[PDB]
Amino acid sequence: TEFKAGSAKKGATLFKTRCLQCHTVEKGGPHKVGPNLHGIFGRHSGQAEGYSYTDANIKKNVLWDENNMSEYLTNPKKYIPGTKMAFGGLKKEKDRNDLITYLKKASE
Ligand code: HEC
């Protein structure tokens, strides 16, 4: 959205051993370490009711889109007060730029 955009770079191989380790963009995703994302971006924070979420994320309504999301992906444990998301942060806008770039795809 605002980033320098990507180019279907190494995004797929990213999520795999980056988010997949926790999550599942798919629908069938029964949920593992984290809730399912799917075609996020546009909704208000978490979008899963069946699965028990956190009282921090849901309590944010951080309308996902592109930059925002990344804004959290980087520092999810700061922005979100009480994020069970044990990610830490990529701190590498480089990948981040590709993350969303591809994410949007994976999400769609
Ligand atoms: C495990 C070490 C994680 C990795 C790697 C990533 N995520 Fe994550 N995410 C994780 C948790 C434990 C949670 C919170 C769930 C809880 O209830 O404990 C999250 C949350 C998300 C969210 C918001 C959903 C929500 O649960 O409220 C998003 C949009 C999200 N995670 C996306 C996502 C992406 C795209 C990642 C790879 C770049 C990723 N996460 C990594 C755990 C883990």
Domains of the chain plus CATH, in order, are 1-108 (1.10.760.10)
The Cα-based distances of 56 to 29, 33, 45, 76, 82 in angstroms read 22, 16, 10, 11, 5
Both structure tokens of 103: 């994410």
Contact 83, 57 (CB under 8 A): yes
Which of 16, 23, 69 most suits a substitution to test ligand 1, by most atoms within 8 Å of the C-beta?
23
Instruction: Find out whether 66 and 3 touch, Cβ atoms under 8 Å.
Output: yes
Instruction: Read off φ and ψ for residue 79, nearest 5 degrees.
Output: -45, -55
How many other C-beta atoms are found inside a 10 Å radius of the C-beta of residue 54?
Answer: 18
- Structure obtained using: NMR
Treating both helix axes as pointing N-terminal to C-terminal, what angle do 67-74 and 93-107 enclose, rounded to 10 degrees?
Answer: 130
User: Phi first, then psi: what are they for 48, rounded to 5°?
Assistant: -125, 125
Taking the C-alpha atoms of residue 11 and residue 6, their distance in angstroms, rounded to an integer, is 9
User: Is 31 annotated as belonging to a binding site?
Assistant: no
In three state form, how does the secondary structure of 3-36 look? CCCCCCCCCHHHHHHHHHCCCCCCCCCCCCCCCC
The answer to whether 69 is a known ligand-binding residue is no
